[PDB]
Design a protein around this nucleic acid. Structure first.
Ligand SMILES: CC[C@H]1OC(=O)[C@H](C)[C@@H](OC(=O)N2C=CC[C@@H]2c2ccc(NC(C)=O)cc2)[C@H](C)[C@@H](O[C@@H]2O[C@H](C)C[C@H](N(C)C)[C@H]2O)[C@](C)(OC)C[C@@H](C)C(=O)[C@H](C)[C@H]2NC(=O)O[C@@]21C
Ligand SMILES: [Mg+2]
Ligand SMILES: [Mg+2]
Ligand SMILES: [Mg+2]
Ligand SMILES: [Mg+2]
Ligand SMILES: [Mg+2]
Ligand SMILES: [Mg+2]
Ligand SMILES: [Mg+2]
Ligand SMILES: [Mg+2]
Ligand SMILES: [Mg+2]
Ligand SMILES: [Mg+2]
Ligand SMILES: [Mg+2]
Lengths: 240, 58
RNA sequence: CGAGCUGGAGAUACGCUUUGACUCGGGGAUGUCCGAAUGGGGAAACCCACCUCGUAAGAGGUAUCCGCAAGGAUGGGAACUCAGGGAACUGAAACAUCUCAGUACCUGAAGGAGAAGAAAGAGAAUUCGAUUCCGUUAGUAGCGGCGAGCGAACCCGGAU
RNA sequence: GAAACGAUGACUGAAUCCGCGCGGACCACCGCGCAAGGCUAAAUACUCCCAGUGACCGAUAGCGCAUAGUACCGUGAGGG
RNA sequence: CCCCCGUGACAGGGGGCGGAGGACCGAACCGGUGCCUGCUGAAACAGUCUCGGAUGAGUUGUGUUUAGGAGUGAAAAGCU
RNA sequence: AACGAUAAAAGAAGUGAGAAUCUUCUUCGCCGUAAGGACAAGGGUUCCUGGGGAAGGGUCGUCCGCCCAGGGAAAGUCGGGACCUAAGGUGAGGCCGAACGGCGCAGCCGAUGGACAGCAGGUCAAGAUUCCUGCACCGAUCAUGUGGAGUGAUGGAGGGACGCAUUACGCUAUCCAAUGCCAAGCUAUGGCUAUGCUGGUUGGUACGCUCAAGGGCGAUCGGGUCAGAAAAUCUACCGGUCACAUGCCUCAGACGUAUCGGGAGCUUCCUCGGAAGCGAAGUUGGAAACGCGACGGUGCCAAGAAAAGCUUCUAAACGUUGAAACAUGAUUGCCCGUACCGCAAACCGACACAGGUGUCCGAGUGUCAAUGCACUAAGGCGCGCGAGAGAACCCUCGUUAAGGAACUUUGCAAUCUCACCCCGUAACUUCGGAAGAAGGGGUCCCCACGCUUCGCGUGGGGCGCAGUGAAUAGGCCCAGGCGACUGUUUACCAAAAUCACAGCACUCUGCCAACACGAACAGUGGACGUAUAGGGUGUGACGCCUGCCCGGUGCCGGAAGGUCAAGUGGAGCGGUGCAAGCUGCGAAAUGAAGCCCCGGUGAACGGCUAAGGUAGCGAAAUUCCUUGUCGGGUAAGUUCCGACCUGCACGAAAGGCGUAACGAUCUGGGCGCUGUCUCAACGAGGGACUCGGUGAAAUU
């Protein structure tokens, strides 16, 4: 049980319900996690403890850097209490060390991957997710992201050795409605159980369906929702 | 609404005709034997309070 | 002004008045607190401060936007004026262009009025000579699912 | 529309007085004007307020009120 | 968790002990199943009886947020 | 018609013009986890006193929550402000926008949370942690004395700081018992003569070597600067040195002593009922919190506000000759709230309305327990018409010969069953269940003995028709449909087979994500998340499974070609001028996404021409003919179960088939019981009828 900030609940924007469903669940305080790790380069840290920290799905390791500054870090699958850890270019590719992709070997499994130097971790953060290094290009490294997509991440971006913790959300089977409620409000309200007024599927006389669409107009099974943007150049082979 | 209801106003005649039996019957007042102020038969005289002798106060 | 007055109040008491009450004109001096509201806060009319002078009582100051400053501005107006924005019912015996109509409404700015105004003009006389307003031209010319229907201007006569 | 002229959001972007704009595509000729700077009384519109008048009303009329935006209704706008 | 018995592809089974649950019965409390009553009501939706939930996807105060083709909706075109 | 719950009333005495209705006495009855008491909201003088008696009061009033007049409301410590922050609101500067305006960091506003000093009594007609009395406490300012030096932000750190369940030990509030104590008297009906009866039986504070559960704590010297912006003697980290039990520190509460208080009652006066004075006893034993000790123990996952006050640090600063802190005086003590009603005749419901309204306290006896049920304390109340009668009929009830579902759409309704203890208990199953299955027996009183008590066990005896002797109080079972389950819904005719659900799938989205709100290159939600995540669609636990058709439509993918817009391109055609020229119109070619066209795709829309049903089910919530046909059950079976197949018109995530358990679901059967019924009777209460009082309505 250790220090953090309060994460007050909210399911609607500066007015009305914008992200559908979302509502119940326990109180939960926000724990500040170290995603950047750069300002602690060269300083060694000891894994004080791993902790149950909601807001995440992935475990959290309580780190103590020899200077006195205690920081929380995404605990990776394998990290134990007492195991030392360091950040920077001058840092070994060992369990829990933060080092840019240029110093990171090929085929070597990583997580907490950035996208722009500084900013912080943005890829493979959930438990069990990992990015595997494919092979260095120019001032960019090709990687295999959790989805299966290949991205050009510029070598200068930090990473953490190993796959993310919390083994597997598998034996977690919820079981009863209300385990869902311990977290988020009655989800999936069928649009076919709605009225012509309410949603496009809604209406008719009994059980049905006729054209396949979401809440508003669109269509959902197979329809490229992606834009014709810049980031497409720093990307290779999408599908799955 | 108010299920059975009257079909026509009942005339000034008709209304008064059913009234033929409403006329009150005046008491059969008798003179009192010992204070003379009238009394009801079989009742105690209200004035002297007698019923052969004086039964009630005042 | 010239004997009354003491508000409607018609009610008793106290009184005031020709050393001119009362009422009528016209200027002053007071003018709590809220309100643009303006020290800060606020569920108007209440709560809480700081500065300066001051014998305590008490008096003055503490909003933002223009500009050296002087000095100006915020808010309020029944309708009328111009501007930004701008419907539908309705009519077309249905309706979509069209109509209703740049009407209703909202919003901004302002005044006792405003707007507009001193020809890169009107129009065919090598006439006129800033603008507005009224008459008339004239239901003309024209517009128009060339349908419903819409509808000028010059000339000339006047207000100025 | 044969649709000129004004105006202008986007893109362009001239001449300087043997110059420039217009005269209902457009060209010639004839004719009327000086843009891209500003100010401006008066006649005109209205009626919160005041006065005067009326083939206007006179208490179910006339303003909603012979005075009340009250009583009363409504959470409120509002209605009365 | 601590002890007792078993082995032939089997697991377990016994005692203690602990104190789990959209677990059970049931009041407060939330609710509205069936009948009657009530239908110019005691009441513009109720009453007596009976009945569902009753540690949960629970109930409830204050404060605050979302509204008009708009909100909200464990979804009746419900509620506003 | 009604006069607003069937919780009653009776009499006497008084008052008055007038009395069922106002007052007083004595009874009666009703509530008593309330129908008693204390708040909050809300109301606004309704509060108390004296007077009134037109209207209001469902009747009458002499009375009132009504009408008039007067009065009453007292705070340094209680609640709020002069303190703090949450959601939210606002917001100089800053980001957007036809206007109006929309956002938005710090800051500020905002309690429903944090923080913080007073306890016991007394008493107006009407106030009390507010006034009075007794004794405290808090901050500030100053005077005195001790101290003899530091004080220590707007900044740092520590602290405030927070769940759900269960539970060990001590306690108190509080409650019971008695031949404990104290007080008052008396009783008699037959007795008792007190070992009977009734009542009371200790709060505040101070001091105390007295008993005390439970709770809380490491101390110090160092090292790195790379951590807290900087500094720190503070805090974090690493290290060295004594950290078992103990050891410190605090004492819920009890006990003793003293003192102020209260205390059953007793007493004197009385203008009829108050005022004043006095004042006994303080035991032993039991029970006991949701309160206190306390931030205790354990277990669990869904992982449990912030900020100030507070404590510790240094920066700046004034300073060491007059410090901070302690101690004893004195002085000081702002604003608003405070009456009264407050589960209701004072609030919301037009009404003195059978409804609604957040928190707290809520006694005794009996009953495993309890805030249940019955009676009852304290306390409150009899519900603002009354009186007769004892018809029809209507309502709420009690009993019922013989029969027992024959009632009927349907056992609708109403019975039966009913608590606790012992015995006992089926198919089926997901191994938990089904289960309170089903069924049987016990239950009171006394005495003896045994024991863990309020008690319970064995034995013997007693009484009644009957012993959870009254109240609270499951009827049960067989089979089927649907839905797995708890849950949700049509406020006011539908609670369900609807919606949701755990689980499954298709699919989209690489992060300024897809998507969504929006004037908007604003801002925001998704998300302080990041593909073991988020959006959308569908199916709907679990088990076995989920087939064939890609022609049309949609989606993804191809591009060799056909089509295809603005623009580029200006060949050519024409107007006018004497002309240079200025102008109207203007092909070919080239020019993007889209469409034609090719292939894929089914838990894509769909079908059973692109193919004609794989299992499984089938007269079905699907079957027209139809009461299909045979079987079951019945005396008799349009329904129901079972087969069969001729499926008008089943069929595999618009899921197919099954499934233990669950259900105010729907269907058929059985046992039980019964006024549903043959077939109705008697009895009760409230109305209906009668008199007095008040007196509506739709309709015409
Ligand atoms: C309870 C009192 C209220 O009356 C009511 O509700 C009762 C039940 C309704 O009766 C009826 O529906 N039935 C009576 C006979 C058949 C019918 C009926 C038919 C089928 C079923 N089916 C099942 C299987 O159950 C049930 C009933 C009333 C009488 C309705 O009148 C009937 O309308 C039919 C359309 C035409 C009928 N005639 C003309 C042939 C006519 O009689 C109605 C519409 O009111 C609903 C009238 C208006 C005036 C109102 O609204 C008043 C103000 C009501 N409002 C209020 O509050 O008081 C009320 C009087
Ligand atoms: Mg008259
Ligand atoms: Mg007026
Ligand atoms: Mg029950
Ligand atoms: Mg039940
Ligand atoms: Mg904010
Ligand atoms: Mg009677
Ligand atoms: Mg008789
Ligand atoms: Mg079957
Ligand atoms: Mg169900
Ligand atoms: Mg249910
Ligand atoms: Mg009568």
């Amino acid at each position: 049980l250790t220090e953090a900030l309060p994460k007050t609940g909210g399911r609607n924007n500066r007015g009305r319900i914008t992200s559908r469903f979302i509502g119940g669940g326990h109180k939960r305080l926000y724990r500040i996690i170290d995603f950047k790790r750069r300002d602690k380069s060269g300083v060694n840290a000891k894994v004080a403890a791993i902790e149950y920290d909601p807001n995440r799905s992935a475990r959290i390791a309580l780190l103590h850097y020899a200077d006195g500054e205690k920081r929380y870090i995404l605990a990776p699958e394998g990290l134990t209490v007492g195991a030392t850890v360091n950040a920077g270019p001058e840092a070994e590719p060992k369990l829990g060390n933060a080092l840019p992709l240029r110093f990171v070997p090929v085929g070597a499994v990583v997580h907490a991957l950035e996208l722009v130097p500084g900013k912080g971790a943005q890829l493979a953060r959930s438990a069990g997710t990992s990015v595997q290094v494919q092979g260095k290009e120019s001032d960019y490294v090709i990687v295999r992201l959790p989805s299966g997509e290949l991205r050009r991440v510029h070598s200068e971006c930090y990473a953490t050795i190993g796959a993310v913790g919390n083994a597997e959300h598998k034996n977690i089977v919820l079981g009863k409605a209300g385990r869902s409620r311990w977290l988020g409000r009655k989800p999936h309200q069928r649009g076919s159980a709605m009225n012509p007024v309410d949603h496009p599927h809604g209406g008719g006389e009994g059980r049905t369906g006729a054209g396949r669409v979401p809440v508003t107009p669109w269509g959902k099974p197979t329809k490229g929702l992606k834009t014709r943007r810049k980031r497409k150049t720093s990307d290779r082979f999408i599908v799955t | 609404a108010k299920h059975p209801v009257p079909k026509k106003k009942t005339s000034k005649s008709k209304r008064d005709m059913r009234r033929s039996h409403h006329a009150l019957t005046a008491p059969n007042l008798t003179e009192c034997p010992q204070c003379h102020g009238k009394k009801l038969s079989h009742h105690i005289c209200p004035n002297c309070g007698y019923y052969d002798g004086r039964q009630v106060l005042a």
